[PDB]
């Protein structure tokens, strides 16, 4: 209702960098809020695409940001009569970024890896890798839970079981309040998908440069399955955390599997041991139900609610015709140990090919009325198709069907305005939470400030 659309602040990265593909608020030890921006096609120092991360200090005028340094040199280690290799070209560093406490976690989902042993190999494959920075100290660590030293032949001999070679670890990412990093890896187990969890503290304390294959004893990966419903499901395309089992001592994970069950799509709510607590099924094949997931209590009862995006949903129209517009499904969490039911509300896009529900951001309480709010992105929405972000305020009944406000892309065609979103943080200290919107296509980020 009260995001100011006139007085925008623009932050810009380099041409072709995809600055804005991912972003988050980051708060330093002093409490000062900056903005971490991912730029997965940033040129490395040798004119090859590696990706990069930028830490932007809050300024009304915006502008350019300093590049948060990471090692972009490939590594080789000849050990145990094997040759371990990392390949950072086209790794897409900054395809996801997430902040927790005084730590920034930026992932490169397409970092490749290989292991050679005489004439055999593991295969050069995108295991992914996350880079961890503690900016105020300079400490760096990495986490790459899918790297292995098993040769190609052994996978063949074991029917490709526990095959983590194509994980793309850090494709999606989230951190719990306690400091557990949870990574989505949709290529896990030959494209079923998997989740990798490890405490940030333990990632830092177990990492040393040059080792490449090491143990994080406290880590916890999801499991492989022979259930064909899961094949090519891309379980971990999106990930979130919340409280859904009533036990405040346990944390629950929310996982998007947008091509689950022959492209029907699904989202799952799991315990931290990866036991399924609930499954929400897709409504329509190829709709990409589970592309985006969001967790926030929208109806003021203190129980987290779930929002799922299906940005290629095709709406029925007159004369048996279908129109790709996207959809978002609101699931309100009921009282007691009851299951999540059917959706309390369906929000459907109105622009053809708009991809409404491509991103969903909790805004916190934008208008301070007691109910939390959300923003939904339609990155090719609006009459012109430049992109649109729509704000929905919470209420006793859940969310409103009519948006309280529409933000139109200030960037040209192709910007993908809204493809990334973050809210729920007060960047200027006026007492109202603000919204950051990425437009990777235009290499920029727009900051909207909430006003009284």
């Amino acid at each position, epitope marked *: 209702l009260n995001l100011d659309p006139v007085q925008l602040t623009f932050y810009a990265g380099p041409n072709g960098s995809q600055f804005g593909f991912s972003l988050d608020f980051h708060k330093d030890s002093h409490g000062r809020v900056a903005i971490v921006v991912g730029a997965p096609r940033t040129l490395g120092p040798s004119q090859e695409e590696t990706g990069g991360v930028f830490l932007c200090p809050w300024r009304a005028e915006g502008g350019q940001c300093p590049s948060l340094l990471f090692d972009l040199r490939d590594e080789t280690r000849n*050990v*145990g*009569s094997q040759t371990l290799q990392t390949f950072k070209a086209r790794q897409g560093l900054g395809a996801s970024v997430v902040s927790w406490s005084d730590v920034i976690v930026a992932c490169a989902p397409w970092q490749h890896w290989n292991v050679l042993e005489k004439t055999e190999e593991a295969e050069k494959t995108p295991v992914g890798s996350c880079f961890l920075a503690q900016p105020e100290s300079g400490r760096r660590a990495e986490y790459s839970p899918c790297r292995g*030293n098993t040769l190609s032949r052994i996978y063949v001999e074991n029917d490709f079981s526990w095959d983590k070679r194509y994980c793309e670890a850090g494709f999606s990412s989230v951190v719990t309040q306690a400091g557990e990093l949870v990574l989505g890896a949709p290529g896990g187990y030959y494209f079923l998908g998997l989740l990798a969890q490890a405490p940030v503290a333990d990632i830092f304390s177990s990492y*040393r440069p*040059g*080792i490449l294959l*090491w*143990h994080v*004893s406290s880590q916890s990966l999801s499991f492989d399955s022979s259930n064909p419903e899961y094949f090519d499901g891309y379980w971990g395309y999106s990930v979130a955390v919340g409280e859904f089992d009533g036990d405040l001592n346990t944390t629950e994970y929310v996982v998007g599997a947008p091509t689950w069950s022959w492209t029907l799509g699904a989202v799952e709510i799991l315990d931290s041991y990866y036991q399924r607590l609930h499954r929400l099924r897709g409504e329509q094949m190829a709709s990409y139900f589970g592309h985006s997931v969001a967790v926030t209590d929208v109806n003021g009862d203190g129980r987290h609610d779930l929002l799922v995006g299906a940005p290629l949903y095709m709406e029925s129209r007159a004369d048996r015709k279908l129109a790709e517009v996207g959809r978002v499904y609101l699931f309100l969490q009921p009282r007691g140990p009851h299951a999540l039911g059917a959706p309390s509300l369906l929000l459907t896009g109105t622009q053809l090919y708009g991809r409404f529900g491509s991103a969903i951001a909790p805004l916190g309480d934008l208008d301070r009325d007691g109910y939390n709010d959300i923003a939904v992105a339609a990155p090719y929405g609006g009459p012109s198709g430049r992109g649109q972000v729509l704000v929905f305020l919470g209420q006793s009944e859940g969310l409103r069907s009519r948006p309280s406000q529409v933000l139109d892309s200030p960037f040209p065609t192709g910007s993908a305005f809204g493809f990334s979103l973050r809210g729920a943080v007060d960047i200027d200290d006026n007492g109202y939470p603000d919204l950051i919107v990425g437009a990777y296509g235009a290499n920029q980020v727009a900051v909207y400030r909430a006003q009284p």
Partner: antibody
Amino acid sequence: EVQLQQSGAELVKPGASVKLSCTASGFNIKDTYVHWVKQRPEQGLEWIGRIDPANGYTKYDPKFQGKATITADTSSNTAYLQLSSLTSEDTAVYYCVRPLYDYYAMDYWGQGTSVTVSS
Amino acid sequence: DILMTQSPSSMSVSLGDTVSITCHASQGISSNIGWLQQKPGKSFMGLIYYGTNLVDGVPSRFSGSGSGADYSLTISSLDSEDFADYYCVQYAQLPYTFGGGTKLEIKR
């Protein structure tokens, strides 16, 4: 606290076999490679082999091929070393070992199991 | 197999001394070297992994150095507890192989 707890001293006859155990405490045996090392006063330290208890795959120094058989059982969190065809050269202290962080390292050691081969 | 030659096999040293044990590999092992300590009648404790990294809990007076085929463990300011045996192990190649060992002995 990571701790490898090995089985007790063995007194065995030549030509017989013996099976030493090493149980994980404060961790799961499948977490890492587990190695077996031999120590003798004069000949020093010799690496025997390793197992990946997650899948049972083993490697051996050819010197011990067909004498040593390393196994593991994740149910009982135990790794085992079996020596067949015992000779006087097998009189030694035997250790199980595992790395701290580095996959390939040799950082944590059991207390040792003494084997004495005698008639 | 890679031959690990350790030197010296013993040294007679005093409390407070700084000492170095060297290890020569028969080929380059690019820091894939560990250092181990065995106190009298005791089992083993790992000191260093991958050339220079201290195992958790190991005192700062221990340090590793070297490259290629030649490495060193230095103990700065010997404690009474440091009079023990020390061994290198390489894991560049299987089979893993060990040094002959160095015994730190008390000078008198």
